Design a protein around this motif. Sequence first.
Motif, short mmCIF file in Angstrom:
data_model
loop_
_atom_site.label_atom_id
_atom_site.label_comp_id
_atom_site.label_asym_id
_atom_site.label_seq_id
_atom_site.Cartn_x
_atom_site.Cartn_y
_atom_site.Cartn_z
N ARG A 45 0.96 -1.49 -0.11
CA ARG A 45 0.07 0.18 0.27
C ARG A 45 0.93 1.47 -0.29
NH1 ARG A 45 -1.99 1.18 5.76
NH2 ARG A 45 -0.20 -0.01 7.00
N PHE A 46 0.89 2.38 -1.11
CA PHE A 46 1.26 3.17 -1.09
C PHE A 46 0.38 4.51 -0.74
CE2 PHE A 46 4.66 1.66 -4.52
CZ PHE A 46 4.36 0.64 -4.33
N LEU A 47 1.57 4.88 0.53
CA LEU A 47 0.15 6.41 1.07
C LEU A 47 1.50 6.96 1.44
CD1 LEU A 47 -0.64 4.53 4.70
CD2 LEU A 47 -1.49 4.00 2.52
N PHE A 48 0.24 8.52 0.46
CA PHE A 48 0.60 9.98 0.34
C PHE A 48 0.32 11.01 1.58
CE2 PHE A 48 -0.04 14.51 -0.93
CZ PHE A 48 2.04 14.78 -0.58
N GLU A 49 0.51 11.08 2.55
CA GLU A 49 0.05 11.29 4.02
C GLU A 49 -0.85 10.71 4.71
OE1 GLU A 49 -0.75 15.58 3.06
OE2 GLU A 49 1.06 15.93 3.08
N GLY A 63 -1.42 16.82 -4.80
CA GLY A 63 -1.04 18.06 -4.70
C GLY A 63 0.96 17.65 -3.93
N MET A 64 0.96 16.92 -4.68
CA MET A 64 2.84 16.66 -4.11
C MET A 64 3.39 17.72 -4.75
SD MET A 64 2.60 12.84 -5.01
CE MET A 64 2.14 11.24 -3.80
N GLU A 65 4.68 17.91 -3.91
CA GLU A 65 5.29 19.31 -4.68
C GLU A 65 6.63 18.27 -4.77
OE1 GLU A 65 3.89 21.70 -1.22
OE2 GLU A 65 4.96 23.17 -2.75
N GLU A 66 7.79 19.31 -4.91
CA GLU A 66 9.25 18.79 -5.38
C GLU A 66 9.89 18.19 -3.82
OE1 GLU A 66 11.07 18.93 -7.64
OE2 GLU A 66 12.90 17.99 -7.63
N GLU A 67 10.55 16.69 -4.05
CA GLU A 67 10.91 15.84 -2.54
C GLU A 67 9.60 15.26 -1.73
OE1 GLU A 67 14.64 18.10 -1.24
OE2 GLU A 67 15.09 18.71 -3.03
N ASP A 68 8.64 15.88 -2.20
CA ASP A 68 7.15 14.80 -1.41
C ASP A 68 7.84 13.48 -0.73
OD1 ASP A 68 6.14 16.29 -0.11
OD2 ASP A 68 4.25 16.94 -2.42
#
Lengths: 77, 10
Positions: A45-49, A63-68
């Motif tokens: 499972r790949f989670l962003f925040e 809403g991803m930014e650089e180096e997130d």
Amino acid sequence: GEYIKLKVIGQDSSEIHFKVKMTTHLKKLKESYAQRQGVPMNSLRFLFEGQRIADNHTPKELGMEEEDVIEVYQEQT
Amino acid sequence: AEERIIVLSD
């Protein structure tokens, strides 16, 4: 230019970075990452925040930014 | 432990 660099933190706190376009569906990242761990993608499972990344999510939509950072968790039972 | 960057194609 429309690319951003993302750090994928795996379970051993090792890291693989991906340079993707802001508009890329994130399924390629998942498939490349799971291939490089030698594991089934559906074991992961790949989670962003904390939020699960779908095959059709994009960095911009999320809403991803650089180096997130994306965290790779073991899938739950 | 070396840096690993993958470029993905859209």
